[PDB]
Symmetry: C4
Subunit: 355 residues, 4 copies
């Protein structure tokens, strides 16, 4: 609710082309298809093949910033990105070579920031997952077995064995209800009362495990990335030790691209920003283009008024952002700093129009 995410977060074309490329598959997977578009898209693999391959050697030029780096992750796919299709071309003479389009599926995951964020936490809490995962199977066969006791007589063809019922168990447990094979008697139908009760409580916990400390990491992502952009601010030599931890939870940093809008004039003022790198377009008679290490919004927040200028992204600005309460928190936190922002709330009244 408090950030301007822009400049094509889904940026690199190395990520983009997996999407159209994998859609190239399915037309091959269909009988009664004409040969025209059949191979027309077979070329398109050669495009992305050639394309990453065009990118590839530029990547293998790893003399860029070659001091200390760990690029086994980023490189691990680029290698097989072009090898597996190639060997797939020959040894699999039949068209099924295309079935090695399971390969590009990591290329999104190659430069997927937020995916290492995933795997980071699983190596702290999977202790729980396993204890639940076993317990999932505990309750699985504890319950899956109870049906073999019964309907083997009159449902051999469906419940004539154990894993036939283990199948129904997870489908009965995992919120699903396929609806191919269901009991007929009373007592087996009694038991389902506890099952959904169970699995919705189990995944009541288990899926809860994920977002539980995941959110900590994501709420932590807003700090580890953002104890940076702190000393750049010429004002933050005086902030107390315990002051920052209180604040940086809410502060997020994102970038705007050149030419974009930042805050349009007249809209209801509801946030202020901290600039640390780039330049803006403060729409005034004398445009007050503040460069790295600035801020704006106090004019509207102390007043509770609409915007005083159509600030637009003159350049690619690495931004921060902030709403009132947390700035009211700051204004409440120290009278030492509200002095200058009071002055700034008067300086920028004349300095917006003047130089």
């Amino acid at each position: 609710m408090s950030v301007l995410p822009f400049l094509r977060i889904y940026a690199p074309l190395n990520a983009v082309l997996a999407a159209p490329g994998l859609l190239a598959v399915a037309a091959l997977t269909i009988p009664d298809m004409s040969g025209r578009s059949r191979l027309a898209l077979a070329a398109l693999l050669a495009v992305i093949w050639g394309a990453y391959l065009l990118q590839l050697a530029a990547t293998l030029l790893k003399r860029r910033a070659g001091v200390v780096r760990d690029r086994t992750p980023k490189i691990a796919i680029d290698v097989l990105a072009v090898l597996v299709p190639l060997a797939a071309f020959l040894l699999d003479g039949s068209p099924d070579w295309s079935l090695y389009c399971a390969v590009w599926l990591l290329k999104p995951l190659r430069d997927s920031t937020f995916f290492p964020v995933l795997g980071r936490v699983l190596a702290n809490e999977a202790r729980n997952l396993i204890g639940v995962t076993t317990l999932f199977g505990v309750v699985l066969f504890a319950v899956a077995l109870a049906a073999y006791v019964i309907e083997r007589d009159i449902q051999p063809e469906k419940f004539g064995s154990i894993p036939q019922a283990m199948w129904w168990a997870v489908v009965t447990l995992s919120t699903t209800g396929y609806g191919d094979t269901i009991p007929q008697s009373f007592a087996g139908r009694v038991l389902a009362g506890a099952v959904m009760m169970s699995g919705i409580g189990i995944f009541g916990l288990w899926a809860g495990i994920l977002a539980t400390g995941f959110y900590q990491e994501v709420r932590r992502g807003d700090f580890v990335r953002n104890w940076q952009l702190v000393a750049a601010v010429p004002l933050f030599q005086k902030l107390g030790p315990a002051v920052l931890v209180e604040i940086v939870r809410a502060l997020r940093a994102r970038t705007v691209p050149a030419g974009a809008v930042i805050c349009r004039i007249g809209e209801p003022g509801d946030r202020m920003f901290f600039v640390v790198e780039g330049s803006v377009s403060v729409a005034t008679p004398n445009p007050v283009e503040l460069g790295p290490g600035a801020f704006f919004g106090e004019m509207a927040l102390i007043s509770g008024e609409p915007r005083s200028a159509t600030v637009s992204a003159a350049t690619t600005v690495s931004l921060l952002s902030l709403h009132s309460a947390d700035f009211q928190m700051l204004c409440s936190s120290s009278p030492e700093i509200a002095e200058i922002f009071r002055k700034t709330a008067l300086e920028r009244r004349g300095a917006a129009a003047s130089a």
Copy 2:
């Protein structure tokens, strides 16, 4: 648990008539229907057409408070509210013109406060959504493909292709279990063990993303709306800087209409209110009708007793509300303020009966 929401929050008839109006459709959508009610409700569109159209020009009289405003949202539908039916009337000579009742569906969303509250946060966290949304498709085709490996032999008609299985994937993943086409062999049935495990963990996170910071905004909605109604209180010149942030999290403001009940006598006392605008009906021999900027409940909360008066909404009062703990928090926070509320806990003992 701590608020009196009244005075028709679902107030404007501009919102109301979409509901009965869209129910006008379906009778047209049915064969063997008599022409009587067929067109009788076709009039009802002309009503709401004429009705908003009656409202319309009053809205187009936007000389009301015409200083600085941003009404592209509110106006954007009112325009098409009457145009699309009109052009639909002619060019679509067949009755299908009624199928442009997809149009009024924004009219609720026109004056839907709490909907801009929705779209506000999606422009901060959709960074996550996309990284998950891709990852959803990662795990989709990563898994959806695994079945084409197998049942193409004996299920051409069901699993003779890829998207036929991508269909089963999300239905298998998204908690659903339609139950049209399911495997027959072992290994494909092995794989589903990880799928519900996955999708319930995925949406274990993904849907968790929404309420996660949504609640922050909603918990923030109780402040941005409510740093107002603060200076109006003649007592709050002394409240410390850090004091307010602690408090306003719990305080919500709502309005009661005239004639309604506020707190009935004899009921178990469990909350106190802050009045800031309007008037009440304090049921005493001399009704102590306190106007803008007052409060009541301390008589019962310090004592832990039932109500001392049937306070009823004499007028449309913009209210606040508060339970003990957070007032006990206040009584615990400063002895300076408990002095006067101690006195008030004696003044209103005589002043309730007297003038």
Copy 3:
């Protein structure tokens, strides 16, 4: 994890008999049933009828504590508890009179504490529910309509109309997958990708609304009930103002019945209790039976050792309970109090064996 809930929380037989009573119904609901047990359980209604009716007049003796009370809730069912069966007996001459066993279903809800706890919060946040509830219908017909566009041609019998598709919508949206009627074409199957994505995000929020502030009330239930049992403690004249709010979040009060066990000797010490009313059985050579207003566990918690005595519930004791951390929090909070609990950690070493 920190409480001894005992003494039959599901206590009153006024609640108990709805369960066996409503099971009396179904045998009537079955053809080819013998008349023996048919009416044998028809008597059992007359039992519970007579039983509550036996209880009834004792309840109508409301001269007990008749000072100021609000018993429209508790009485509202007792009235109809016996009237509706009675009038049902005559005017419904056929056996269907039994179908007015929808009546007792409130009798559990009569003395269901934790149910007013439910309805309390819905009158603060249903503002959200409605805005979502409309939005549910927004997304309902926004999406439900999209299918009538398509399969009316080849699925008249299933998708020949709108509400026929509104049916499929919520079943498609609400996590269900019945599996009676599903599309055949591509584009309609494209759309479901957003639906489960939607409804799991919608109820990603909407059901989240409930537990969100519900938990606040339940976490608040541990205070409003428990600012009581505070002044009874002869030690708590010195606790700071801000000290209590920190503590009472964790403290829960429950009751143990006479004869029960409280803490068995030798088990790993992990909690301490505060007694405020009743008496115990501290298993020592001289049983140190401490009455109202006492505590125990510090002997094991400061030491981190097993139990020093088999404390058993000599009487019906209204208890409290506490784990270390929050007592370590207290020991960390003030050196003034750890003095006496240090002494108590030596007094009860000799005083447990001696008198």
Copy 4:
């Protein structure tokens, strides 16, 4: 995200063999099976039978640490682990004796730490569960009955009775959608709009109850286990009373085995550890092998740089772990301690290479 869990948390073979053992069952459960593997795995039961039985007497040698212990839980299964198969061998002459493989299912739960963690909390909050559990049945039959009103006429074979509809209720309520028997008329289809609305709100709460305070226990598990490993640190005589509670929430302790990696050189520095028992392999020219009661990472965290040494687990080290923010919190908390870690950030610059 902040811990190195290693050394085979799923360690004891007493837990391991339930998994392969119970898979021994199903081949017996299948007709047209050859006798070869039929009994070949019947031996494998005799293995695990003999195996635990081999383990058994060693366990019955409970003279190890025989001072004060509570091993009714751990022993309770070991007894029946070998008895039930044995009596099952004889009295059940037919092969169905194998159906007493419901017995080993507790052996995982025998030494399942994190399972007593489960049952601990259910004895504090099941107050809620019951009030909801009744309420589940309230809403069950309140709604399940509504259908018998209607389709008994034209669906005797499906809705000719009450529990036939109670079946459809939970399946309709519990997110499932089996899809065997569904209404045909309008009004019964109207009602489902509230059902999924209900059950997703009900389990919106009910399953929420579990993770709610479960997480408290699990978040508490990181303290009760970890007020230990505190006094061992020779530096923590000066930490303030309120300081520790702030910290130990994040700190988790786990063990690494000998030979493993701890932090590899060159990787991005993102955490620091506290050693309290064992020894390491700090990869330097003079390996600075610090034994019980040490730490490392400050060199990278104050600098924000990659790793300064390939620390590898020389021995089985009981570890702690910590990220910056919470150490920045510590560096922010007291200047008294940053002095020595400043010095340590210079001592280990020379002392890493030197001795």
